[PDB]
Design a protein around this ligand. Structure first.
Ligand code: 9YK
Ligand code: CL
Ligand code: CL
Ligand code: CL
Ligand code: CL
Ligand code: CL
Ligand code: FE
Length: 498
């Protein structure tokens, strides 16, 4: 067993290097490794490995008082020296972390004593604590497990301070975690967690039906949504659907014809019946999105005007911009050129493909020829980085990344949002304002900057918001109610009480 559970993940958890990315899986890094301060659902952080902290008047120097009773799972002490060595290891690979502005902000980290840790910043970076709370990269592995005093070239054993320990990993088969019996905090009720490697959504559903696994926990891609709906009515099972956690949207390339034209982007934003899309492809399980961020997101309740489904208006917008229908043709032309737009997506993602077909059909009704480009994952990511797309599926990052970290990353050239925004005359101004808002402690100015950035992105129709999606759970009833973690990429295994 009653204290052992089995669940699934599409891939193995990776080597669990706390300071690196793919193929490390974030939820698993968060199981083993811990932050100085812990993110809470209300948007605050609480003391964690750091019991308290102070900051200088200019907000650039921070001193953390660490707990003195914490051991890594291998018995070695967690102290300020261990913490400082981790910050060094991360920042020795600084360029890799460019997406996360704290990595550019930290100018120094040193242990003042075994319990005192001092971090100095370039500027008064307001999201400092929230970014320390993230799953990665600023969490702590035992320094003994560095390879030649670094982590960027790999680690030895994945030794953290957290409530779970990686027991064993079998590539392409499973991963087993066990409870840390020497954890500094509350002991999890669950003793052992086995992750069966199951990449196919239907096969995950089958695995649950047959009883091979006890728990599924994920976003809208977790399992087939019609199957989820059926499960929700089945008294033999338990299901949950959370309140929305993030946005799914198209990014439109403002630097590529024909999406470089505002009138075209505006028309596209009237062309899709989102409610019907969700009811048709998402089995009615998600919410309609009108804006890049839902109004419930911090700093984002701005009264932005939705573009509702309105094919008549979309057509009128295109006509006015000189995109008219040739005799006998259904696809508009302007200066000889057809209104043709390429929508790229991961070809093996059935849900993406289904939504893409709906979007293609809806846009054809207003005279736009959307060409579907389904490709392998690596090719799509390459397209995102270098701007080789007309439209692309995209999503925001959920708490605590939205909106500040998502906005921050818009400045990074190797990101889809930067590329999508490249054609905007005001792109430099937007990037300047994103830089400013992150260092503002004038609360009035901070709200004003967020309003200006988000209003410009909205008015320029950079995105086509589709849905605010939720977390979903399928579980054996004996496990009980399954809690959600404040951080959308984490799974609160330590909170489950069968
Ligand atoms: C392309 S993988 C990569 C390479 C170099 C530096 C960082 C990364 C990882 N990503 C950094 C941002 N990434 C946070 C993370 O992975 O820790 C954003 C993010 C936020 C919430 C959920 C995510 O799955 C997610 O990837 C790149 C990306 O997701 O665009
Ligand atoms: Cl990496
Ligand atoms: Cl991955
Ligand atoms: Cl706080
Ligand atoms: Cl000391
Ligand atoms: Cl070594
Ligand atoms: Fe990422």
């Amino acid at each position: 067993a009653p204290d052992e559970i089995t669940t699934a993940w599409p891939v193995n958890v990776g080597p669990l290097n706390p300071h690196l990315y793919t193929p490390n899986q974030m939820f698993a890094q968060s199981m083993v490794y811990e932050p100085l301060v812990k993110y809470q659902a209300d948007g605050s952080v609480i003391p964690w490995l750091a019991k308290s902290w102070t900051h200088s008047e200019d907000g650039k120097t921070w001193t953390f008082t660490l707990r003195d009773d914490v051991k890594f799972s291998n018995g070695e002490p967690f102290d300020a020296e261990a913490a400082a060595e981790n910050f060094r290891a991360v920042l020795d690979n600084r360029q890799r972390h460019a997406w996360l502005e704290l990595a550019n902000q930290i100018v120094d980290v040193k242990a003042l004593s075994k319990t005192e840790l001092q971090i100095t910043l370039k500027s008064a970076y307001y999201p400092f604590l929230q970014e320390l709370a993230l799953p990665r990269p600023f969490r702590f592995i035992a320094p003994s497990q560095f390879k030649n005093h670094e982590t960027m070239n790999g680690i030895k054993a994945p030794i953290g301070t957290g409530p779970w320990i990686l027991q064993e990993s079998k590539l392409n088969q499973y991963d087993v975690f066990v409870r840390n019996e020497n954890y500094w905090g509350e002991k999890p009720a669950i003793k052992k967690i086995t992750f069966n490697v199951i990449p196919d959504p239907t096969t995950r559903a089958v695995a649950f039906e047959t009883g091979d696994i006890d728990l599924l926990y994920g976003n809208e891609g977790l399992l087939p949504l019609d199957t989820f709906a059926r499960f929700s009515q089945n008294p033999a099972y338990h299901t949950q659907l959370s309140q929305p956690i993030e946005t799914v949207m198209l990014a439109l390339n403002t630097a590529k014809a024909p999406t470089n034209e505002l009138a075209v982007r505006e028309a596209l934003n009237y062309a899709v019946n989102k409610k019907s899309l969700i009811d048709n492809a998402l089995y009615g399980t998600q919410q309609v999105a009108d804006t890049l961020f839902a109004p419930s997101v911090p700093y984002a309740n701005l009264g932005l005007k939705p573009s509702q489904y309105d094919p008549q208006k979309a057509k009128a917008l295109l006509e006015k911009a000189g995109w008219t229908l040739p005799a006998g043709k259904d696809i508009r032309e302007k200066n000889g050129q057809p209104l043709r737009i390429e929508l790229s997506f991961i070809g093996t993602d059935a849900l993406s493909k289904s939504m893409a077909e709906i979007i293609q059909a809806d846009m054809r009704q207003i005279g736009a020829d959307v060409s579907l480009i389904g490709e392998e994952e690596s090719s799509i990511y390459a397209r995102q980085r270098d701007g080789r797309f007309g439209m692309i599926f995209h999503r925001t990052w959920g708490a605590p990344y939205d909106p500040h970290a998502f906005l921050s990353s818009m400045r990074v050239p190797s990101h889809a949002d930067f590329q999508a925004q490249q054609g905007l005359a005001d792109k430099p101004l937007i990037d300047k304002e994103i830089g400013e808002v992150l260092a503002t402690h004038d609360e009035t100015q901070r709200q004003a900057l967020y309003r200006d950035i988000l209003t410009r992105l909205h008015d320029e129709a950079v995105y086509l918001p589709i849905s605010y999606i939720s977390m979903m759970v399928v579980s054996k009833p004996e496990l009980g109610n399954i809690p959600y973690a404040p951080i959308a990429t984490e799974i609160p295994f330590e909170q489950i009480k069968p």
